Design a protein around this ligand. Structure first.
Ligand SMILES: Cc1[nH]nc2c1[C@](c1cc(C#N)cc(-c3cccc(F)c3)c1)(C1CCC1)C(C#N)=C(N)O2
Ligand SMILES: Cc1[nH]nc2c1[C@](c1cc(C#N)cc(-c3cccc(F)c3)c1)(C1CCC1)C(C#N)=C(N)O2
Ligand SMILES: Cc1ncc(COP(=O)(O)O)c(CNCC(=O)O)c1O
Ligand SMILES: Cc1ncc(COP(=O)(O)O)c(CNCC(=O)O)c1O
Ligand SMILES: [Cl-]
Lengths: 442, 442
């Protein structure tokens, strides 16, 4: 007693929008640093009947029965997880149930510090994530600043984490967790120095490596597992998995942490796990361990260097004047345009990127930068030589943005009337669609 | 630069376990009251590329661009949602972003009461959910008893919500939220009398209808929307959607609530929505609005009535001696066997059900009942006449459970040893597999 008609027939209206999304993705130069494209196998797992099953609890420790095949799936996933991040089942454990990065962080921070607990994170306007304790002058914007008591550190004038400021605050404010690992940070992290600062205050060291996860697994960037108590990562960004998250925990440094983390996830915060997610992670984490994935991650960094370089050759400024990872933050000051304006211009030419603060920005009000990243385009086949064109396109978009602003004024609503039907943007869009359209597409 | 070979070739090891999960599901009599089977269209949406997309914020209020198609998807889902539950765009709003039931409840409760706010829910051992404020002597098990301050009401001696006890407690405790709508409750709910209790204290009325959602939509059971400030529901149980949830909020009774709830979800708790979930939810909600779905939901209740009646005819007791809904709680005291044992016996014969408390239990390690439900089997095509067989199988399992206990003792470790290789269970299993295996299967 059900309807087994294909999606096309049963719900034409939805299928049509979906058919469109797919075309927008196919015909876009996607530079959203946090985005990627899943392969067909990952998507088969996501659409698998394994999500019919309720599986509250942990393997061999379920509330319901008939969970043996589910238990294998979850245990496979924990195993492939620890292997990928080059850690022994004996020193580290992982929880693979968190539905997403924000959930994982909240769950893991609660596990460590409880309600009214003290945490330190990087400010959002400086490149920290919302769940690193974000609050405003007027509001406790993230639960992490409300259920916890948080203090936020900043970057210096050159766009680097000010470790000396981290220390001043940590001794003065006395957190039980210090979070490092960022949403928008173009450079590698000195985890050793974080590990040393925590020790003077007795704090835990939390590394959120969602943006650089593949670099960590592939031994291309600094290893946080060498120093940290907890490591979290989403599975969907550079890692190229489904939308999900991982919590890693150092048993050796902390006996009692395993049950603390597993209990935080369920039953404090979550109910039934989404087993299709757990399955999709398994599928991808296997791909991750292969030398082919190491190729890809290397290719990611090469494109990112070639891109930063090409932009500089076009006299465009970058925060920290470079990148060690997959992401670049462009500084727009020398052109007197905002990131929102350029975001608007890139939107019109099928170039996806986002506005972003620079140190010299007082508030999150008027971002002076844009964040671009190379994982999505690398997946689609772009090589170092293709970074020229992309840089060429962003330079052209910046120039058009500067022209439109002189014509239509400083206010965004005013600025925005220039875009529709602009001969230059339509020519540029066409160049983009034409190049993007024919790129390999999972 | 990716690997696009089918799941079978790419990760055969996973494909096997998954193929096994599928066979186990097809060959099981599934009586888990919270379980169902999604159609193929819902699973095409779960594995659609729409989840490649970052979409933080709300439609026409996104942080990133390129989100016009996503916006069309999310607005369609809010629209199909409000109508399915027969409420006006103008009086009710809905948030469709919560990743799961537990997240939805925690988010919605946060929105209404804040950190350290007072809430009232049904005890777990009585039939409330974990997120309704559950705690233990010595341990705050759910975040809902830690981030909030909670008190837990119980059912009376006959298995009914003791409304008088609710009032005595509420007036003493002075909560800002009283939650009704339960995990294991075989009877309908008097929302009007709950509305009246809240009014005497000025608390909000929270209705979690995850288990009965279709009944409410189809105008078969009482309407919580008539009386409630907030209604949550999962989309995966009787509603037959993906693993997701909805928060409903009454704007007409509460100006301001719409921002309070939307902001609770993001950016307080969540980051990027899972657009594949949202797409899948939209797809199912369309189906929910057809009269074919009203028929299915009627069939659920008919089956549940027939099953209760058949069990009664076999001299098995039911908490409240019947059901108004999709689920039955069997009281096993007259056979002196625990739910744990029967669950074990049912596991051995491919009959999925779970242990459950009865009023006369006080502790939760001793449960004297089992919960069964009819949505899954109804989906698979079983009609009233089939409920006899299902009752006959359950009676036979109870019988074998009594016999194995007299042979092996009252301790579960010992009891279990009687199960493997038992001539009667293997006989019963085959009858189950042969009937189950051949039933319609989405
Ligand atoms: C949208 C989002 N999610 N998590 C983020 C952000 C992100 C962000 C940018 C902007 C802007 N403009 C605004 C927000 C934001 C999101 C919610 C509430 C709020 F007050 C601000 C968040 C964007 C820009 C790059 C990522 C950010 C920053 N800066 C960081 N570090 O973290
Ligand atoms: C697993 C789960 N999640 N939410 C629930 C339960 C459920 C439950 C049953 C049993 C039993 N026996 C034990 C638990 C449970 C789950 C987590 C922690 C805990 F202390 C207890 C939870 C289910 C299993 C049968 C009904 C329940 C009840 N009773 C209610 N009302 O709510
Ligand atoms: C460092 C970090 N941690 C956690 C998350 C949260 O993941 P979910 O959205 O899956 O909750 C993000 C998301 N960052 C979004 C972006 O950079 O575009 C992140 O950048
Ligand atoms: C009252 C109630 N609310 C919410 C949920 C579900 O939350 P998740 O989607 O996070 O699992 C349940 C599921 N209860 C599981 C069961 O009855 O079997 C529930 O019983
Ligand atoms: Cl999903």
């Amino acid at each position: 007693m059900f309807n087994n008609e294909p999606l096309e027939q049963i719900d034409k209206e939805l299928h049509d929008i979906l058919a469109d999304e797919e075309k927008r993705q196919r015909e876009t130069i996607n530079l959203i640093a946090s985005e990627n494209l899943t392969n067909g196998a990952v998507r088969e797992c996501l659409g698998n009947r394994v999500s019919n099953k309720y599986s509250e609890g942990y393997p061999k420790k379920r509330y319901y029965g008939g969970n043996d095949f589910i238990d294998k799936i979850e245990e496979l996933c924990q195993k492939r997880a620890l292997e990928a991040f080059n850690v022994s089942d004996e020193e580290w454990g992982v929880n693979v149930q968190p539905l997403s990065g924000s959930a994982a962080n909240v769950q893991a921070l609660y596990a460590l510090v409880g309600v009214k607990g003290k945490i330190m994170g990087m400010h959002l306007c400086s490149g920290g994530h919302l769940t690193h304790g974000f609050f405003d002058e007027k509001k406790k914007v993230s639960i992490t600043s409300d259920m916890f008591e948080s203090k936020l550190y900043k970057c210096n004038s050159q766009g680097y984490v000010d470790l000396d400021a981290v220390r001043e605050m940590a001794l003065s404010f006395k957190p039980k967790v210090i979070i490092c690992g960022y949403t928008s940070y173009p450079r590698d992290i000195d985890y050793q120095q974080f590990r040393q600062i925590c020790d003077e205050v007795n704090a835990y060291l939390f590394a959120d490596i969602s943006h650089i996860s593949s670099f960590v697994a592939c031994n291309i960037l600094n290893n946080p597992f060498l120093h940290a108590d907890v490591v979290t990562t989403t599975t969907h960004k550079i890692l190229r998995g489904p939308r999900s998250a991982l919590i890693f925990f150092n048993k050796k440094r902390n006996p009692g942490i395993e049950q603390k983390i597993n209990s935080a996830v369920f039953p404090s915060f979550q109910g039934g796990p989404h087993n299709n997610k757990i399955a999709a992670v398994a599928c991808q984490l296997k791909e991750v361990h292969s030398p082919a994935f190491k190729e890809y991650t290397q290719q990611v960094l090469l494109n990112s260097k070639a891109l930063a370089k090409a932009l500089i050759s076009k006299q465009i400024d970058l925060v920290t004047n470079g990148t060690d990872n997959h992401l670049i933050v462009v500084d727009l000051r020398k052109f007197s345009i905002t990131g929102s304006k350029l975001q608007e211009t890139c939107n019109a030419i099928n170039v996806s990127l986002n506005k972003n603060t620079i140190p010299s920005d007082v508030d999150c009000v008027s971002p002076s930068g844009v964040r671009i990243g190379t994982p999505a385009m690398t997946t689609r086949g772009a090589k170092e030589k293709d970074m020229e064109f992309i840089a060429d396109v962003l330079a052209r978009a910046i120039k058009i943005t500067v022209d439109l602003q002189e014509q239509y004024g400083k206010k965004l609503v005013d600025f925005k009337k220039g875009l529709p039907g602009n001969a230059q943007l339509q020519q540029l869009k066409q160049e983009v669609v034409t190049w993007a359209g024919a790129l390999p597409f999972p």
